[PDB]
Design a binder for this molecule. Structure first.
Ligand SMILES: *[C@@H]1O[C@H](CO)[C@@H](O[C@@H]2O[C@H](CO)[C@@H](O)[C@H](O)[C@H]2NC(C)=O)[C@H](O)[C@H]1NC(C)=O
Ligand SMILES: *[C@@H]1O[C@H](CO)[C@@H](O[C@@H]2O[C@H](CO)[C@@H](O)[C@H](O)[C@H]2NC(C)=O)[C@H](O)[C@H]1NC(C)=O
Ligand SMILES: *[C@@H]1O[C@H](CO)[C@@H](O[C@@H]2O[C@H](CO)[C@@H](O)[C@H](O)[C@H]2NC(C)=O)[C@H](O)[C@H]1NC(C)=O
Ligand SMILES: *[C@@H]1O[C@H](CO)[C@@H](O[C@@H]2O[C@H](CO)[C@@H](O)[C@H](O)[C@H]2NC(C)=O)[C@H](O)[C@H]1NC(C)=O
Ligand SMILES: *[C@@H]1O[C@H](CO)[C@@H](O[C@@H]2O[C@H](CO)[C@@H](O)[C@H](O)[C@H]2NC(C)=O)[C@H](O)[C@H]1NC(C)=O
Ligand SMILES: *[C@@H]1O[C@H](CO)[C@@H](O[C@@H]2O[C@H](CO)[C@@H](O)[C@H](O)[C@H]2NC(C)=O)[C@H](O)[C@H]1NC(C)=O
Ligand SMILES: *[C@@H]1O[C@H](CO)[C@@H](O)[C@H](O)[C@H]1NC(C)=O
Ligand SMILES: *[C@@H]1O[C@H](CO)[C@@H](O)[C@H](O)[C@H]1NC(C)=O
Ligand SMILES: *[C@@H]1O[C@H](CO)[C@@H](O)[C@H](O)[C@H]1NC(C)=O
Ligand SMILES: *[C@@H]1O[C@H](CO)[C@@H](O)[C@H](O)[C@H]1NC(C)=O
Ligand SMILES: *[C@@H]1O[C@H](CO)[C@@H](O)[C@H](O)[C@H]1NC(C)=O
Ligand SMILES: *[C@@H]1O[C@H](CO)[C@@H](O)[C@H](O)[C@H]1NC(C)=O
Ligand SMILES: *[C@@H]1O[C@H](CO)[C@@H](O)[C@H](O)[C@H]1NC(C)=O
Ligand SMILES: *[C@@H]1O[C@H](CO)[C@@H](O)[C@H](O)[C@H]1NC(C)=O
Ligand SMILES: *[C@@H]1O[C@H](CO)[C@@H](O)[C@H](O)[C@H]1NC(C)=O
Lengths: 524, 524, 524
């Protein structure tokens, strides 16, 4: 009954092509309609292959527009390019002037940082004097600022580095004084030592204008320091081999409110004696998930107490690779929160005190091992950069909701010549009374030096050591860059419907027809 | 005849599903085909709900591309950070040196601005001397530069502020001299007093290169001013509490040719003694209408004689809210063109002259009312910023066709050391003959001071007071950001057609079928 | 048999509308169904006109996203704003001090460049002394730096201009010393004379951080030059009429590795005595072909040995138009590689030596022709800019795959005051031994001057002539802007299918139906 069931199907079905093939007029008619059906099906499949290829590519649609939705005021991190305090540096210069031998200066100072620095210098110097020419590269790394920072307790350095009271002369967010003890947070940098981060107390709307922004006056000069008739250097502290080296000014980093700043990768420089204007144009980027792109809401290596950034993830991935291979952490990269209690690669590993007296081969072997650790870390950093598979293995992706800022950099000398610039001196020393901050028991030396240097007669030259920062929102409207799926499932279904209705002519109520036909064939 | 009409319909209709339900093979067949039809309709409706939700969302499509279509050369507005003329400031300093009492200096000068300033200072001082400690905040606002600008006639300040002849030493657009009297327009700023806007005489194509741009030399230094052995201040004029304060240099704003500049929100700073290069990269943004977005072709609060900007609309909305509530206009925001004849909030409201002799409680009550007005304006400004509904109520939207500029900021000391820098002095004083401009009857004092200060021997130090601005188009091709409707009505119709042809199988020539069926049912 | 064939067609066809028109119930029925068919067809055609208008518009889809794919480290081109060597300039100043007459100084120097310069000055001066007032404009162009560069052999200028050994004190890419003879390439600029381009030796991944970037120290000051008691000028070399003129510092251009820099259109300025930080944010733009946009993979006027840029194409198009009309090439635009051996427009065309003795009318006519050539070139440059058809005729299009860089500009005084800045002097003169480079047979004069100027006691002032550049990648992730076709042929086919299934109801297996019908009509 195959002929009968196919004939009944052809007479009752809605399939637009089958009846002509079944109820053919002649052999040539059946052949033609067969080739028409074949051609329709072939073009159908060829087009659907392209359609499904487009869909499974998972394209993205990106829109850029200006929206009034506000973003939080950026956090400002300031690092003084002079890492140590003026008094400590002057004291060190005077001691090295008085006696060049570091061994004689171990217990000559009341400051713990000076004593530790002298101990380290005395422990390293005899080997330097004996083996400088034989192994110059080893001592080029041992006598470095980062190396000393990794071998001295951070709590000891923090008391000798730049202090907030001696760095931020004045602060003003909007029309109110900054709560200097509530808004400023101190964090440690291997090269800049003490650094300070400003966080505005708080969603809220963003106000425009310089007067509505963040204005601060900082002491960043080095004219207070003693001037030497001949060049003399503090070992380790003065590093001519660094790319920053003897730079004078402030390193300013503009970043979201709850993110770790990275001065050596991002930020801006402000010379002393100039007023820097930072016109901030906010931006927001919204990203979508795995099938269409890559984004992450949290740092894989983090602890979940900081706003996510891709730079932090990449740096922590590099640190993870360094720790895994070399067995130590690089001081130039953040410590892993989940893998604490890891010694720095530049740590001397309890370098013995007896090396101060004899430059024995054992002490040199310890320094050799330190240099080998540094070289291991450096090689791992370079290898991983080219090793793209390692970067992908860390699963570092851009944030799914990122706030970023564009900076309009500008400069202008802050203390004007003549009586125009007297306002700066009156504010710093007459109203804020900057000198009287240091009239304390343990800060008398700084007080006398600032009293002598900043007297009224030398106003024009002395005031050049100060700098002013103005961080203001120049455009309250935020440029939003939102990513979205370009080709959804509904659009895919619509395209499939159009192609089904164009080429083959069948529908879903008509693909039931063939289902009933196959049931009838089964139960024939 | 219901059965007959439905049977005839099923036998003659093209509806792909109904005939199987009507001409059912059996009860199970009718049930199946009914559930197939129901399922098709349900999926149809579920997909069309999503489709219509997408359509009525009115999505936008944004394209970013580089096009050769030119944009007009940007207008350049320059404000000298020294608001007053050198002669006026020196005279004021000398008078305050000679006699500290302002009452004795009312009629001691021939300049009207000096007389008005002395009158205001003498009217405010007795209350300051008596009530400074009791009400410090009130006098912190009364003795302000903005307050004095709002209580002195602008036509009086304009003659004492910085003049164009004494500010723009030289100008050159392309290879031709700037028409200094045709291209420069003076406008008043509450803090910078006199400011000047350059408008190029003119669509036209944009030329690249520094030599094809706008080059000008300006006198912005303050070394000409007298240097005092002790700090003495001009009340109101010197404001240590401002975020700009004693800054020295030029405030440069780059904006479209026919727009009001806003130096305190946008612009760049140029220190004296440096050559500033402003590499301009033009941009154009095209936006579309209400159903898909928000854009406006004209400022709602404006008069229609200026190119539209969103910043102007927002500032005028803030001014409108201030005037409505406090009954006065803030001097820090533009005056409303449609609501002229409104006194500033900082206006003293005809403060009597008798206060110069007695510090009576009545005079203090008038100052108290002035302070209350200032505080009302400040509170309204802060409240409206958080009050997002007010911002929406002003109907401020970004322009539908906006031209914007990106600035590449750079600096370099303009007068080179040695004979290299002699070209600057030769141009300023040998060819332009800058000193001989001031050899007039009412400008002799300035002429002598410039003759003494800018002599040949002191060339190296004296020339540091000048600055040079170079504004040039760095990329003649414009980055265009055009917004367009992503999902048009035709695309919606195509998607509806695809879905109709996929799920239900009906068409419009087939939805006539049911129309005839219902007519037949009516006329049965 | 027309009625029979149409009836059989209507009874057997799947066309959803024709059977109702053919097998009409009544006259009103036939009329209605005819108008329904007409309406369906009309709406169909109206929608397809819009669809085809959208398709043949060839719209583009642009996506902006952040990707980890690296781009090559940018090439850095540095031009000293002091074009000539210190020794040559000092010698010229001394000779013009000793004797003002240029004719007496023809053979007084051993340097070939000085002799050629004196010959040119002596050939031009007698006409200048006689006809300065009559034709000031002619001599304003003849006595120009560009004019002298076009009339003196480049190989002669290169030996007298700034040398690499006396310009780049130190270089460091990543942690390694730059191969100063392999990575630096010298190229000639008409205004800056000798300029140098740095190309990193090498796809490769991009490393972040200042210490991983390019750090260099350059001598760019002019304090070494003799200071004159009175203003005296070198004719042609000192050009007060230029927009750059007496600027002191370095012109820094950041561009892709294999592209010609254009300092006068792109770049940044760095003053001496400051450390410039160039935070590089890379970008990549991908563009598509003729039907959807315009892009080119190679410069039409180029030789195919340089990475394509639109700026180069536009400049070479301008040069092509200048050469075609004026018969000469402008020195301010690149020479056409395919049309070499073309004299500059500013070339004096073998100006005779006899003019040194007599200011005859013939010599003035030659200078007049030179001025006419310059004016022709200038007029052609201006005319072509407005002549948009010429710009289109050159077929200059943006590159199909372009790499661009965004620069974060910052400054900070490099040599710190006091012992902090001793590192810079120790590096320059103690380790690099900058003075000892010039202790050669033909450079003794420079050696003595640098020995005297850079002594230890004058460390603070003398070191201000140096500058430091730090070019580092601030964001290793690249912002990609890719253009793609928005409306493909497959989408067009899907929309046609949806519209065919919505309005008219026909398919392709049903447009065969009418093909068989017309065959039957033919063979009736
Ligand atoms: C800066 O902020 C701190 C912390 O909020 C303020 O100190 C607190 O003040 C409140 C009263 O306002 C007290 O109850 C707390 O005991 C104080 N200490 C702490 C640790 O919270 C301080 O007053 C603020 N300074 C200014 C000038 O407002
Ligand atoms: C999201 O990130 C993953 C990272 O694994 C991407 O997958 C990699 O894609 C590259 C090519 O771009 C391949 O070479 C790798 O082999 C892929 N990884 C693996 C594990 O196979 C993925 O393509 C990214 N998604 C999007 C949309 O870009
Ligand atoms: C600067 O522009 C002004 C205004 O166009 C010029 O002054 C006019 O010059 C024309 C002739 O060119 C006269 O008919 C007008 O009477 C002048 N005055 C005004 C108010 O239009 C002036 O000549 C231009 N300066 C230069 C140097 O070209
Ligand atoms: C155009 O602006 C209007 C401003 O009224 C927007 O409508 C407001 O939308 C916000 C949410 O974004 C609501 O909270 C407000 O209640 C809306 N206003 C009113 C009066 O109801 C509108 O959404 C904007 N259009 C687009 C496309 O963004
Ligand atoms: C800088 O690069 C040049 C060119 O590669 C080096 O000179 C070549 O060195 C190789 C051996 O490494 C020799 O075979 C070639 O003969 C040298 N000359 C040339 C022209 O290739 C030079 O050694 C490099 N300098 C440094 C410090 O590495
Ligand atoms: C690619 O460039 C060509 C340049 O010829 C463009 O064609 C020109 O378009 C303008 C309008 O924008 C017309 O005025 C010209 O007449 C056109 N040229 C010719 C020879 O007719 C073309 O439009 C560009 N393509 C795209 C997609 O922008
Ligand atoms: C690159 O990375 C993969 C996976 O991290 C690793 O297996 C491979 O050894 C690496 N190659 C090199 C040369 O380090
Ligand atoms: C500093 O402190 C001492 C002791 O408290 C006091 O006598 C002296 O007046 C103070 N000096 C200043 C400037 O405050
Ligand atoms: C201010 O200090 C300087 C330091 O050099 C000194 O020369 C000058 O005499 C001092 N002035 C007064 C008034 O003490
Ligand atoms: C916010 O704005 C709305 C409308 O402008 C107003 O009714 C409301 O009172 C405002 N709220 C505050 C706290 O000012
Ligand atoms: C200034 O003007 C007076 C009177 O017109 C004249 O005698 C004198 O020479 C002028 N000085 C200069 C420098 O032009
Ligand atoms: C130039 O002015 C300065 C001002 O201090 C003065 O010392 C110098 O003697 C003057 N030179 C001449 C030549 O008048
Ligand atoms: C503009 O360009 C076209 C084609 O290059 C040319 O025919 C025409 O003459 C030009 N017009 C002018 C005013 O130069
Ligand atoms: C300069 O060269 C000469 C001759 O070679 C030598 O005597 C002298 O010591 C050199 N000076 C320096 C500073 O190297
Ligand atoms: C250094 O050079 C300066 C140049 O003015 C000179 O005054 C000084 O005496 C020199 N110092 C030494 C130690 O030669």
């Amino acid at each position: 009954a195959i002929r009968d069931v196919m004939t009944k199907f052809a007479e009752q079905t809605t399939m637009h092509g089958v009846p002509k093939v079944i109820n053919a007029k002649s052999s040539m008619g059946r052949l033609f309609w067969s080739l028409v059906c074949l051609a329709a099906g072939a073009m159908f499949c060829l087009q659907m292959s392209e359609v499904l290829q487009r869909y499974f590519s998972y394209p993205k649609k990106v829109t850029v527009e200006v929206v009034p939705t506000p973003v939080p005021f950026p956090s400002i991190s300031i690092c003084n390019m002079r890492n140590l305090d003026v008094h400590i540096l002057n004291t060190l210069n005077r001691m090295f002037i008085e006696d060049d031998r570091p061994f004689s200066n171990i217990n000559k100072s009341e400051h713990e940082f000076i004593r530790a620095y002298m101990k380290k210098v005395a422990k390293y110097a005899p080997l330097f004097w004996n083996y400088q020419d034989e192994y110059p590269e080893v001592f080029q790394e041992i006598f470095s600022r980062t190396t000393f920072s990794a071998n001295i307790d951070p709590e000891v350095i923090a008391l000798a580095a730049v202090q907030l009271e001696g760095f931020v002369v004045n602060c003003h967010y909007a029309g109110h004084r900054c709560n200097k003890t509530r808004d400023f947070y101190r964090f440690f940098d291997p090269y800049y030592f003490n650094c300070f981060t400003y966080k505005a107390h708080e969603e809220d709307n963003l106000s425009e204008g310089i007067e509505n922004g963040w204005s601060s006056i900082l002491l960043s000069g080095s004219g207070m320091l003693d001037k030497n008739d001949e060049i003399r250097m503090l070992p380790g502290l003065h590093e001519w081999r660094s790319a920053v080296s003897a730079s004078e000014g402030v390193r300013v980093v503009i970043h979201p409110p709850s993110t770790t700043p990275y001065p050596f990768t991002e930020g801006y420089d402000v010379p002393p004696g100039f007023s820097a204007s930072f016109g901030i144009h906010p931006r927001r980027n919204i990203r979508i998930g795995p099938p269409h792109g890559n984004c992450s809401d949290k740092n894989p290596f983090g602890d979940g107490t900081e706003r996510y950034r891709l730079m932090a993830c990449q740096k922590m991935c590099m640190q993870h690779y360094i720790v895994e291979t070399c067995g130590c952490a690089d001081v130039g990269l953040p410590k892993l929160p989940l893998q604490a209690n890891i010694s720095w690669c530049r740590d001397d590993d309890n370098f013995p005190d007896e090396c101060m007296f004899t430059a024995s081969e054992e002490c040199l072997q310890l320094l050799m091992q330190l240099h080998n650790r540094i070289k291991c870390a450096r090689s791992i950093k370079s290898k991983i950069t080219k090793n793209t598979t390692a970067m992908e293995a860390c699963n570092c992706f851009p944030p799914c909701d990122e706030v970023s800022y564009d900076v309009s950099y500008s400069l202008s000398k802050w203390p004007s010549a003549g009586y125009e610039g007297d306002a700066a001196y009156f504010d710093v020393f007459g109203i804020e009374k900057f000198n009287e901050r240091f009239n304390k028991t343990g800060t008398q030396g700084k007080y006398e030096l600032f009293t002598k240097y900043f007297n009224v007669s030398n106003r024009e030259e002395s005031m050049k050591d100060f700098a002013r920062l103005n961080v203001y929102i120049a455009d309250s409207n935020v440029v939003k860059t939102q990513e979205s799926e370009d080709y959804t499932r509904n659009q895919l279904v619509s395209d499939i419907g159009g192609q089904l209705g164009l080429w083959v002519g069948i529908s879903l109520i008509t693909l039931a027809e063939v289902l009933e036909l196959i049931i009838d064939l089964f139960r024939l």
